Amino acid sequence: XXXXXXXXXXXXXXXXNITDLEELQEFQGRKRKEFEDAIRRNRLAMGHWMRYGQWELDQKE
RNA sequence: GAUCUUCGGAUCACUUUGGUCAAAUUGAAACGAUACAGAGAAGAUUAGCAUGGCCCCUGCACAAGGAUGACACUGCGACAUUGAGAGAAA
Ligand SMILES: [Mg+2]
Ligand SMILES: [Mg+2]
Ligand SMILES: [Mg+2]
Ligand SMILES: [Mg+2]
């Protein structure tokens, strides 16, 4: 019962929008805060950078 | 005005104003009241040092504290294919 003491933990852990024009800008604003913070945490870290642009084109351009 | 001296005529003295309101709700601290939640290190209890800034208070302080003051990410990818089979479009 050695390999079964590990696999039994995984299966136990395994089992365990938007309206208006105004309310979207709130949603859109908070995601900007999110992104800007992750830049301050890491000056360089291009994953956070690249993402941030992609996200803005789809919304605005 | 004062001193010389023809009643003319001299001579001395020369442009202020430290103002964020011209009369205490609506133009210069926030804290406090209340409600919730209620304190790092992979059992539980537990000292700490750092680390990075668009977070800051105490401090004469390039001492030291403030919970170790508080807060803190980790998909992508510069895309090859092989060889076979099926499908739709030229
Ligand atoms: Mg300290
Ligand atoms: Mg402690
Ligand atoms: Mg202490
Ligand atoms: Mg620290």
CA of A20 to C1' of B9 (A): 95
Chain B nucleotides covered by protein, CB below 7 Å:
53-54, 72-76
Rounded CA-CA distance A26/A6 in Å is: 45
A1 CA to middle of ligand 1, Å?
A: 49
**Resolution in A for the shown PDB structure?**
3.6
Helix axes A22-41, A46-59, angle to 10 degrees: 160
Q: Which of A55, A18, A60, A14 is nearest to A33 (CA)?
A: A55
**CA–CA gap between residue A37 and residue A31 (Å, rounded):** 10
CA angle A36, A52, A17 (to 5 degrees): 95
A7: tokens are 């696999």
CA of A8 to C1' of B20 (A): 73
- Residue with tokens 């789809």, as numbered in its chain: A58
d(Cα A1, Cα A10) in Å, to the nearest integer? 15
Q: Under a CB-based contact definition with an 8 Å cutoff, are residues A35 and A55 in contact?
A: yes
The residue with tokens 């949603």 is A27
Using C1' positions and the CA of A43, the closest nucleotide is B52
**Of the candidates A28, A25, A52, the residue with the CA atom closest to the CA atom of residue A40:** A52
**What method did the depositors use to determine the structure?**
cryo-EM
